[PDB]
Amino acid sequence: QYDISFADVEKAHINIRDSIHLTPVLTSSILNQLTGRNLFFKCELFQKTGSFKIRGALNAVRSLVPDALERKPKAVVTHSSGNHGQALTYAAKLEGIPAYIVVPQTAPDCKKLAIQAYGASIVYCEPSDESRENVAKRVTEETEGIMVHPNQEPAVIAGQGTIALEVLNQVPLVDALVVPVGGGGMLAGIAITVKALKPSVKVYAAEPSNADDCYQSKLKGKLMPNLYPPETIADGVKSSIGLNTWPIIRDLVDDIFTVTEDEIKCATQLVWERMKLLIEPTAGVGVAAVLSQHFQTVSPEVKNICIVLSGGNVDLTSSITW
Amino acid sequence: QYDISFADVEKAHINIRDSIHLTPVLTSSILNQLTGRNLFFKCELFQKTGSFKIRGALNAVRSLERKPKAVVTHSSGNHGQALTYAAKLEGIPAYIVVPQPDCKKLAIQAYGASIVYCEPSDESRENVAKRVTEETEGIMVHPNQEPAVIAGQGTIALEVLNQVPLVDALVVPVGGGGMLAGIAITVKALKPSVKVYAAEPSNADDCYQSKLKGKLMPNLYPPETIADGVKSSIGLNTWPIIRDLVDDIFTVTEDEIKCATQLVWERMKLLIEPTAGVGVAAVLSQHFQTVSPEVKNICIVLSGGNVDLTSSITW
Ligand SMILES: [Mg+2]
Ligand SMILES: [Mg+2]
Ligand SMILES: [Mg+2]
Ligand code: NA
Ligand code: NA
Ligand code: NA
Ligand code: NA
Numbered sequence: 001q002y003d004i005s006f007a008d009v010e011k012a013h014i015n016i017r018d019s020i021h022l023t024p025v026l027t028s029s030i031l032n033q034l035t036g037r038n039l040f041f042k043c044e045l046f047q048k049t050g051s052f053k054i055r056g057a058l059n060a061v062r063s064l065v066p067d068a069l070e071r072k073p074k075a076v077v078t079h080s081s082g083n084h085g086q087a088l089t090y091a092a093k094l095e096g097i098p099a100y101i102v103v104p105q106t107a108p109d110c111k112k113l114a115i116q117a118y119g120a121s122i123v124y125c126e127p128s129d130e131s132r133e134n135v136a137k138r139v140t141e142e143t144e145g146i147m148v149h150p151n152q153e154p155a156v157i158a159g160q161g162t163i164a165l166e167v168l169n170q171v172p173l174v175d176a177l178v179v180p181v182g183g184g185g186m187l188a189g190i191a192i193t194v195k196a197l198k199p200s201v202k203v204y205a206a207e208p209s210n211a212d213d214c215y216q217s218k219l220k221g222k223l224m225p226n227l228y229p230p231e232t233i234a235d236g237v238k239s240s241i242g243l244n245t246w247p248i249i250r251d252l253v254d255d256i257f258t259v260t261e262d263e264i265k266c267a268t269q270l271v272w273e274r275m276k277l278l279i280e281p282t283a284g285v286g287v288a289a290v291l292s293q294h295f296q297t298v299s300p301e302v303k304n305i306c307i308v309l310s311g312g313n314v315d316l317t318s319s320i321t322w
Numbered sequence: 323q324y325d326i327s328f329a330d331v332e333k334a335h336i337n338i339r340d341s342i343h344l345t346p347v348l349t350s351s352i353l354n355q356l357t358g359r360n361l362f363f364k365c366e367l368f369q370k371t372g373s374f375k376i377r378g379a380l381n382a383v384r385s386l387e388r389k390p391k392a393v394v395t396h397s398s399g400n401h402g403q404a405l406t407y408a409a410k411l412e413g414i415p416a417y418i419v420v421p422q423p424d425c426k427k428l429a430i431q432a433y434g435a436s437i438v439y440c441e442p443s444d445e446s447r448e449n450v451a452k453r454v455t456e457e458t459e460g461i462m463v464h465p466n467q468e469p470a471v472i473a474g475q476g477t478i479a480l481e482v483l484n485q486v487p488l489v490d491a492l493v494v495p496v497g498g499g500g501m502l503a504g505i506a507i508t509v510k511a512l513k514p515s516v517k518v519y520a521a522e523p524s525n526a527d528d529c530y531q532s533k534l535k536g537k538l539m540p541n542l543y544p545p546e547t548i549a550d551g552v553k554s555s556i557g558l559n560t561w562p563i564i565r566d567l568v569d570d571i572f573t574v575t576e577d578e579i580k581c582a583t584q585l586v587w588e589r590m591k592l593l594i595e596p597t598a599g600v601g602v603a604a605v606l607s608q609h610f611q612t613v614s615p616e617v618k619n620i621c622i623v624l625s626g627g628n629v630d631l632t633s634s635i636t637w
Contacts, residue, residue: 024346045591276367276593276627312591320635
């Protein structure tokens with residue numbers, strides 16, 4: 001019915017479990033007091049590569065084929081330079097194949113050094129989409145590589161879903177999961193899994209109000225991507241939802257909570273100071289959502305809430321600027 | 323025979339466990355690989371109040387009408403905060419002595435302490451606390467020499483030994499040595515084949531000197547170190563225990579401490595305070611490399627996470 005099924009998620013689980021961490025679930029009496037709920041934090045910031053994206057990336061490397069005629073990926077290629085590019089490079093390393101990241105001439109010098117440092121080869125294009133698409137198709141062809149989309153690729157969605165298998169096992173009494181949404185690969189993967197195993201558990205998304213395409217798409221009942229590049233501190237959720245995650249989100253996510261930039265910053269600082277977890281601000285989005293005024297509308301029966309702390313890849317010095 | 327025995331630690335554990343977190347033991351692929359050992363981090367930065375000191379503080383408040391109508395102490399950092407919280411749990415006001423930075427003053431108020439102001443001298447802080455203690459019918463809890471504190475800090479080891487059945491060594495940062503002493507009593511009673519090591523800054527190496535010289539040699543002058551929770555010297559009540567039960571003392575430099583803290587932040591995503599990076603620094607150190615390879619499973623106490631994030635820019 002959708003681009004993935006719970007069977008794909010469990011295959012992904014079997015595919016990646018030997019190489020990822022089963023991250024712990026931590027609690028905070030302080031955050032319980034502030035919210036009135038019993039919170040559980042799924043600590044994907046402690047995952048390999050610093051975010052949950054190693055799950056989708058490794059599943060993609062282990063299950064996609066480059067060609068009808070070649071069953072084995074000989075390289076991986078992607079347009080993402082942040083958490084997805086870092087996770088994919090590491091997945092390719094584990095598999096003994098080369099990683100390529102297609103990089104605009106125009107992206108910052110910091111970006112270029114980062115990619116090289118986590119072990120990918122960089123291939124340069126013009127800033128344009130016609131150039132990005134062209135050089136990538138080129139690299140993919142010369143290397144017999146696979147492109148791995150950060151959020152719309154079925155194998156990636158299915159790998160991110162494995163977060164929910166662990167959550168449901170680790171938190172048997174959970175009433176809801178709260179997931180930051182960008183392109184919606186993780187949300188969609190988790191929604192598929194939760195609704196297949198225990199559909200009375202709510203799946204809520206948390207979204208910056210400055211990048212609120214997933215909220216607007218669910219409100220309008222059709223896919224409404226951001227018309228302009230969003231500006232938010234929550235850098236991992238600037239992507240819009242897409243054609244493969246939208247139908248899942250439409251049908252299987254219970255609600256979307258939006259949070260302001262100040263809410264994201266306050267929640268992030270609260271987790272740093274009160275939990276001592278160095279989350280990236282994008283991972284503060286879900287905490288913000290549960291602290292938010294609108295979350296009070298959620299029923300008191302929804303008591304046990306697991307928040308995915310999705311990543312910890314933050315430049316600590318950069319934080320002075322807020 | 324020492325100021326505490328295991329029996330005191332077991333009493334502590336019963337005394338406090340309903341009010342403290344049984345904190346997790348976490349591991350890091352990256353650090354194992356840098357050290358060539360199997361590392362276990364006991365995460366007391368996630369303890370109530372941000373440090374392990376709630377254990378001793380709570381054990382003191384609940385052990386020492388009988389029952390206190392307040393608390394007061396000289397220590398304003400982690401110990402003060404722990405005692406304050408312990409006060410709150412007992413439903414009694416907490417008082418800390420404050421000379422008459424305003425940044426620190428605003429801070430003390432933030433954790434619910436009531437400020438009793440004094441003149442900024444030696445005889446005035448003391449006598450102001452004295453005499454505060456008297457008037458409020460409250461109690462005096464030393465940060466590291468008080469037997470109920472030391473026994474309370476020993477409960478870390480009861481937890482580690484359960485959580486890490488195969489453990490071969492514990493690594494513990496040392497200031498006044500209440501934590502090191504409690505742990506040593508506990509470890510040597512329960513599982514004496516397990517090694518107990520101290521980690522100490524160079525700029526504050528009284529404990530190391532004391533071991534080497536076979537006698538108690540406190541710091542001559544109040545030390546300068548980023549590891550602000552370990553500036554205290556070893557004392558008459560913890561020394562004998564450390565002399566006899568602690569296997570070795572590893573010294574680390576300021577730079578080792580900073581590097582170790584930064585590595586934990588960035589690779590483990592745990593906001594440890596620099597004092598807690600002392601024990602990591604120790605296990606990364608050249609001197610640590612020497613340790614017999616039979617000692618594989620190592621538990622490092624991450625003793626606290628109370629660091630001012632802003633002030634990180636300084637270093
Ligand atoms: Mg329920
Ligand atoms: Mg969005
Ligand atoms: Mg010392
Ligand atoms: Na299904
Ligand atoms: Na937008
Ligand atoms: Na990202
Ligand atoms: Na589709």
